[PDB]
Amino acid sequence: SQQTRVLQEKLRKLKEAMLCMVCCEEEINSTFCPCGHTVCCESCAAQLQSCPVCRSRVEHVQHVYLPTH
Amino acid sequence: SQQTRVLQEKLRKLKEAMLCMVCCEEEINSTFCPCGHTVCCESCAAQLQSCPVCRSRVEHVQHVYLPTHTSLL
Ligand SMILES: C[C@H](CS(N)(=O)=O)c1ccccc1
Numbered sequence: 285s286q287q288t289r290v291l292q293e294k295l296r297k298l299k300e301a302m303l304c305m306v307c308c309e310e311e312i313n314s315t316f317c318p319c320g321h322t323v324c325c326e327s328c329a330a331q332l333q334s335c336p337v338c339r340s341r342v343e344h345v346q347h348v349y350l351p352t353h
Numbered sequence: 354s355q356q357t358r359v360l361q362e363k364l365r366k367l368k369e370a371m372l373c374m375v376c377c378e379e380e381i382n383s384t385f386c387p388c389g390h391t392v393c394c395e396s397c398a399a400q401l402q403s404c405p406v407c408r409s410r411v412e413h414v415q416h417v418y419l420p421t422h423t424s425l426l
Pocket residue numbers: 351369370371372373374375377378392
């Protein structure tokens with residue numbers, strides 16, 4: 285029904301929001317510290333000096349284990 | 354249809370996986386360091402000396418800003 289289409293759209297947008305903002309292919313599993321932006325996969329995060337969201341210096345990258353993984 | 358019910362169930366399980374594993378009421382927004390388990394809201398994370406998944410000692414809690422986050426706004 286049209287309701288099935290609405291739910292498919294919500295599921296798709298939620299799943300897309302869990303993907304890396306840089307490569308768009310891998311799941312987000314890394315946090316820039318200390319700002320806390322958790323927007324990249326480990327490969328894209330490893331190469332950044334500053335947070336791509338807030339420009340704060342990245343002191344280190346913390347790997348995150350999320351239940352949604 | 355039956356597929357509407359299947360999709361509602363998938364959506365519910367995905368939304369539940371984003372809720373704190375301790376209180377079940379607030380969104381996950383905190384990481385236990387150094388283990389990395391990201392399973393609690395900031396209120397439950399502040400009260401745990403050991404990670405509830407792996408029992409590693411919590412040295413500190415890192416707040417996480419996730420693109421999936423939602424609010425009353
Ligand atoms: C305990 C889980 C959360 S999870 N999968 O550990 O992150 C849960 C929370 C709220 C309702 C149902 C189930």
